[PDB]
Amino acid sequence: FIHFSYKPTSFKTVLVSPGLCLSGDRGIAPKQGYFIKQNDSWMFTGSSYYYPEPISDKNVVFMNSCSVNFTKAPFIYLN
Amino acid sequence: KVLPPILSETQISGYTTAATVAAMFPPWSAAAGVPFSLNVQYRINGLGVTMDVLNKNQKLIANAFNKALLSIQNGFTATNSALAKIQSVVNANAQALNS
Amino acid sequence: KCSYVLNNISFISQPFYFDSYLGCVLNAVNLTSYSVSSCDLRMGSGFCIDYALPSSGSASRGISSPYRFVTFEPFNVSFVNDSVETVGGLFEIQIPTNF
Amino acid sequence: TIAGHEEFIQTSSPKVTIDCSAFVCSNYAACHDLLSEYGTFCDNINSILNEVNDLLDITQLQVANALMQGVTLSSNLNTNLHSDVDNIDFKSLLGCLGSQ
Amino acid sequence: LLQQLFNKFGAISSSLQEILSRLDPPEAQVQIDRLINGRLTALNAYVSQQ
Ligand SMILES: *[C@@H]1O[C@H](CO)[C@@H](O)[C@H](O)[C@H]1NC(C)=O
Ligand SMILES: *[C@@H]1O[C@H](CO)[C@@H](O)[C@H](O)[C@H]1NC(C)=O
Ligand SMILES: *[C@@H]1O[C@H](CO)[C@@H](O)[C@H](O)[C@H]1NC(C)=O
Ligand SMILES: *[C@@H]1O[C@H](CO)[C@@H](O)[C@H](O)[C@H]1NC(C)=O
Ligand SMILES: *[C@@H]1O[C@H](CO)[C@@H](O)[C@H](O)[C@H]1NC(C)=O
């Protein structure tokens, strides 16, 4: 059997958030990725490649509540 | 005679210590890249439990985890199944060597 | 013990001898601070025997043995120099930029 | 609530080695002479036992490889300081780890 | 397995040619029987290992 694998070669050190607390005390969590901060704006990136992209309903899972250590971000009512 | 294994027992204990500590701390290799309690939340939510109840009762979930670990630890007393399975291996080897 | 070996078993000349966890080793140097990830002569309980050929550049005027008694350690963990607590609410993690 | 229960799985056994000649003919030269005409029974016993022990060693290395495949740790980790995350205590499950 | 045809197993010789060309029919049976027993034991052990 010949197995092919994805191998990373270069790395970067990023500060990430595992969830966000929105207005109405709602929550979002990233769907196989992390929330990063670029130019004082929250953003999404995948976990196996560094590529910032806008937060939309494809990247997140919505929650009618918010966890006790999600990061408070009232600026976001984005796409 | 009985030969020693090629890896010692402190080595295997270090391997399981590494595998346990890889789920708690912030590379999170053995916990799908998310923190531990978030992994427990998503895993319970995949059974049909809503996110509101899990966001409310996080302290009770952590207390039940601590209680289950303590009940595991205080329970290796003479009627366990795992201790019987461990001692059957040693008894069988000693019986074969004496026979 | 090496006293039992050099007294009640052998009486022939042996310059290299030392006691170890596995027993008495002859014709080998004690080098258990050194580690080996792939060995061909595995002795048990985490140790191994390596073979070091003395070549032309390192002319051993004072003699040694070409056999070294080293530590067998076949598996490791990758390490990062990141932090284990939150740096102001966020976690410090390493993400690939090329593959 | 949350329930917990444990389970043992056996992955190894003791590694028995046998000196065939000392077992059969203890210290006597006439017995060793009579056993020398049986040829290759003792060598066959030793070779089968070496095969069994090699299988034991291979499975031990496979278990250890499964445990350690793909885990990346922090170099600043210390099980004296770090034994707790999110009010869950893991001190009874961690051994010693860290550079001290 | 082929090396078991050259053990004596307690007989005077491992070759049946050298037994049958040297002994009486009543005294060749005692020598042939030991070779038969040793070779059947070797075949039994081989079949168990397979
Ligand atoms: C062998 O070397 C180690 C360290 O290199 C040392 O701790 C140990 O005592 C030595 N053994 C003997 C018998 O001197
Ligand atoms: C860890 O083990 C691997 C096994 O191949 C080896 O290549 C590597 O050099 C080791 N690293 C350290 C720091 O011991
Ligand atoms: C790497 O770790 C050392 C201490 O172990 C620290 O002094 C140093 O600043 C770290 N380097 C980086 C780039 O974080
Ligand atoms: C990735 O690596 C390849 C070859 O190593 C290089 O040609 C390419 O420019 C790299 N890309 C980035 C984004 O670093
Ligand atoms: C939230 O963060 C605080 C800050 O250290 C910590 O003490 C607490 O255990 C965390 N709780 C959860 C549920 O993550």
Cα(E21)–Cα(C99) distance, rounded to whole angstroms? 79
- Look at residue D76 and give its three-state secondary structure: coil
Cα C63 to Cα B75, C15, C66, distances in angstroms: 59, 10, 10
C67-72/C42-44 β-pairing: unpaired
Which chains are within 8 Å of A by 3+ CB pairs?
B, C
Cβ atoms of B7 and D58 within 8 Å: the answer is: no
The ligand whose atoms approach the alpha carbon of C79 most closely is 2
Cβ A69 under 6 angstroms from ligand 5:
yes
Long-range contacts of E33-40 (CB under 8 A, 24+ apart): E34/E9, E34/E10, E35/E8, E35/E9, E35/E11, E37/E9, E38/D38, E38/E4, E38/E7, E38/E9, E38/E10, E39/E4, E39/E5, E39/E9
What are the beta bridge partners of residue A35? A17, A44
Instruction: Verify C-D touch: 3 or more CB pairs within 8 A.
Output: yes
Here the tokens at position B40 are 């427990």
Cβ D6 under 6 angstroms from ligand 5:
no
Cα(D56)–Cα(D15) distance, rounded to whole angstroms? 8
Cα(E21)–Cα(D100) distance, rounded to whole angstroms? 81
Tally Cβ neighbours within 10 Å of residue D11.
10
What are the beta bridge partners of residue B75? none
Cα(A20)–Cα(A30) distance, rounded to whole angstroms? 9
Cα(B55)–Cα(A21) distance, rounded to whole angstroms? 12
Of all residues in chain A, the one with the smallest CA distance to B45 is A63
Task: Report which residue type is found at D20.
Answer: C
Cα(D27)–Cα(B39) distance, rounded to whole angstroms? 66
Cβ atoms of C91 and B24 within 8 Å: the answer is: no
Q: What residues in C contact D68, CB-CB < 8 Å?
A: 75-77
At residue D19, φ and ψ (nearest 5 deg) are -80, 110
Cβ atoms of A32 and A24 within 8 Å: the answer is: no
* Element (DSSP H or E) covering residue B44: helix B36-45
Vertex A41: Cα angle to A40 and A47 (nearest 5): 110
- CA D79: distance to chain centroid? 26
Cβ atoms of A17 and A71 within 8 Å: the answer is: yes
Burial B40-60 (b: 16+ CB within 10 A, else e): bbeebeeeeeebeebbeebee
Cα(B3)–Cα(D57) distance, rounded to whole angstroms? 11
Cα(C18)–Cα(C31) distance, rounded to whole angstroms? 11
Cα(D6)–Cα(B86) distance, rounded to whole angstroms? 13
Facing residue for B65 by CB, picked from D53, D68, D88: D88
B2-3/D15-16 β-pairing: antiparallel
Cα(A34)–Cα(C97) distance, rounded to whole angstroms? 15
Cα(D34)–Cα(B28) distance, rounded to whole angstroms? 66
Vertex A74: Cα angle to A73 and A76 (nearest 5): 80
Here the tokens at position D75 are 């170099």
The C-alpha of D4 sits at a distance from chain B's nearest C-alpha, in angstroms, of: 5
Torsion of CA E20, E23, E26, E29, to 10 degrees: -50
Cβ C3 under 6 angstroms from ligand 1:
no
- Look at residue D15 and give its three-state secondary structure: strand
